[PDB]
């Protein structure tokens, strides 16, 4: 009874979506931290080849001009979720002349991830981190293949997910600043990855209230790493 999305267990449960949570584990790590000054975000690349072009590997995509994103797990299912998440923020501005809030973005995203066998296919294999600054300030959210949606203050997913969480709960507090949280985030990264941390293994993305631009760092990232 463990090969069907249309079949329960004697105890609970699935037994199909539980296997979809396991598909996240073989991804790459990603850390996002919510701070009152804004939301920073970090990820690991895992570049395989030197001939492999680096900017064709995306981990941070721009959903909107005040909302970033992060992903892990299956790359093939991720590009489907990013597509409508750009469209649903665009349909909302067309009919309301306003920016869709960061919480209500994922409401539209979770409404299709819970449609895998509930029409009249398989569940997805990708967890997502959504950071953005809406009218309620900076926000940071998190979802899963099971459509379970929640708000987090600082979250780390992918591979090395549980090992990051124990060290990440140690140093977080409410009165952080943005420039403190950036250098606090990649102390965790060089302790959980196996290669030496340089300017080519990672990439950053921030968002601020008055600086809704710049969900990327372009070789100012070299300044942060050299002062670790």
């Amino acid at each position: 009874y463990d090969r069907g999305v249309n079949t329960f267990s004697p105890e609970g449960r699935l037994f199909q979506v539980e296997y979809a949570i396991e598909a996240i584990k073989l991804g790459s790590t990603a850390i996002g931290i919510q701070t009152s000054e804004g939301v920073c975000l970090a990820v690991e690349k895992r570049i395989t080849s030197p001939l492999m072009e680096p900017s064709s590997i995306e981990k941070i995509v721009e959903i909107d001009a005040h909302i970033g994103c992060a992903m892990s797990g299956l790359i093939a299912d991720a590009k489907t979720l990013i597509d409508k998440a750009r469209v649903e923020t665009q349909n909302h501005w067309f009919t309301y002349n306003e920016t869709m809030t960061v919480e209500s973005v994922t409401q539209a995203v979770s409404n299709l991830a819970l449609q895998f066998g509930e029409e009249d296919s398989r569940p997805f294999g990708v967890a997502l981190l959504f950071g953005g600054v809406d009218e309620k300030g900076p926000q940071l959210f998190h979802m899963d293949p099971s459509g379970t949606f929640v708000q987090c203050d600082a979250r780390a997913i992918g591979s090395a997910s549980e090992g990051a969480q124990s060290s990440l709960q140690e140093v977080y507090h409410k009165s952080m600043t943005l420039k403190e949280a950036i250098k606090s985030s990649l102390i965790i990264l060089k302790q959980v990855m196996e290669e030496k941390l340089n300017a080519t293994n990672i990439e950053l993305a921030t968002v601020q209230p008055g600086q809704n631009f710049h969900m990327f760092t372009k070789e100012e990232l070299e300044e942060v790493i050299k002062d670790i």
Binding site: Y1, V5, N6, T7, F8, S9, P10, E11, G12, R13, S110, N111, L114, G117, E118, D120, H142, S146, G147, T148, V150, Q151, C152, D153, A154, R155, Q165, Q169, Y172
Partner: protein, 238 residues
Amino acid sequence: NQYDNDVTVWSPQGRIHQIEYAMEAVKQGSATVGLKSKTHAVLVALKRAQSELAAHQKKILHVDNHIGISIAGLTADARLLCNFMRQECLDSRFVFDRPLPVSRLVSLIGSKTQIPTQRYGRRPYGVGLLIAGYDDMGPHIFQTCPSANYFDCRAMSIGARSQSARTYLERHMSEFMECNLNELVKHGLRALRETLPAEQDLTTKNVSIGIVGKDLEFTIYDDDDVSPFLEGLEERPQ
């Protein structure tokens, strides 16, 4: 064990096991308690944390100005029934220009959940809805089940270890019809504290209380306004 695969297949004992397994998904969720007086119906739920610093998952959600529901079970079947619930509430406002009677809205749910418990191709809805409402004849407390049966009741507790909450409600149900909201709410949340392990306490960050009244619209209080309700309580006799 070969009969334990589909909803269509009957058993040689006459019991379909797939409906019997969807009851077990209700026991995975946390406990929640609903009750009512002559004038006021209050349902109280219990939040559960995911991690040490994520937000707690919400349980009570607004539906209409005279209807609010609780939840226990799958979150996939939760919002799928909510979107069916909200669509039927505004159709009577658009057509009949009256609010729905609460007793006949739940009969639409039992017709809704009956088809995926008979036809192949869709599992039953793993869900534990508690319903409070106001028709023209006072408050109501309803529960549903994944076997598509709906039970009218005056007090009910479902979820994890909710049997100990039922024992508190049976020996205090004679007191519920007369008392008002200053103790009727804290008659209810004295029943949640037996569904807890005996070392931690019901704090302000893990509980939600929703009140709909005869002259009061359905209102959800959480995490800031629970403090006028948690005042004036005794501890557990330890």
